[PDB]
Amino acid sequence: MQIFVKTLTGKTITLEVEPSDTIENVKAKIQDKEGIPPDQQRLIFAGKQLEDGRTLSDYNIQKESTLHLVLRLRGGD
Amino acid sequence: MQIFVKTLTGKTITLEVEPSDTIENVKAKIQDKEGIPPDQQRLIFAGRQLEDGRTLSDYNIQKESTLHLVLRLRGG
Amino acid sequence: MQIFVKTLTGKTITLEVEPSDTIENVKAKIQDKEGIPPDQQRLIFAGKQLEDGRTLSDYNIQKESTLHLVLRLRGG
């Protein structure tokens, strides 16, 4: 099914995924299109950070859900 | 040249800069006009947090580029 | 009194509150109109992060003050 991801520059990319895909698989999908190493990707859905070993279905992510890539600030409080 | 800095209230501060200005220098200009200490300031351009010793041209920040100013939130 | 909350989208909502209202009570009012769980809201007042368990009067928030609503990430 397709899902969407909003990058740190506000571009939205489309991914083809299955609910049983791991977050780690999803991050490799992102890399294949934008070049962002998984190592630097932090994803959120519905206000929750996504753990690499879990699946999309563990977070209830549906068709055409939008994830956001997020930046952890150096020295954040 | 001019660059823009967007703030959480939606306000835009305009700064006159040169490409050889450092990120330190830009936080110092913000302090001078706004009263925000540099240690309270985080600047974001093109999806990255800017580091103090780079120049604007090191980040390909160009005429009429916009940065995002994200302050540390205060306690008490 | 009335106060205002500004969201990410640029929406501004008006809330009818009392100085004895807690931060938690206000977050419930926000949920009631914009759907956001209280545990995923952080309210900011003049750059200060407001904390649960305190009242608007503790922070001296008085009529027509503006709060900024920020996203808070839910633990796991």
Binding site: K6, G10, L73 | - | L73
Partner: peptide, 12 residues
């Protein structure tokens, strides 16, 4: 203020 996303800080 620990996080940032396009285009707003995020607490977390």
């Amino acid at each position: 203020x620990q996080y940032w996303x396009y285009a707003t800080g995020v607490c977390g």
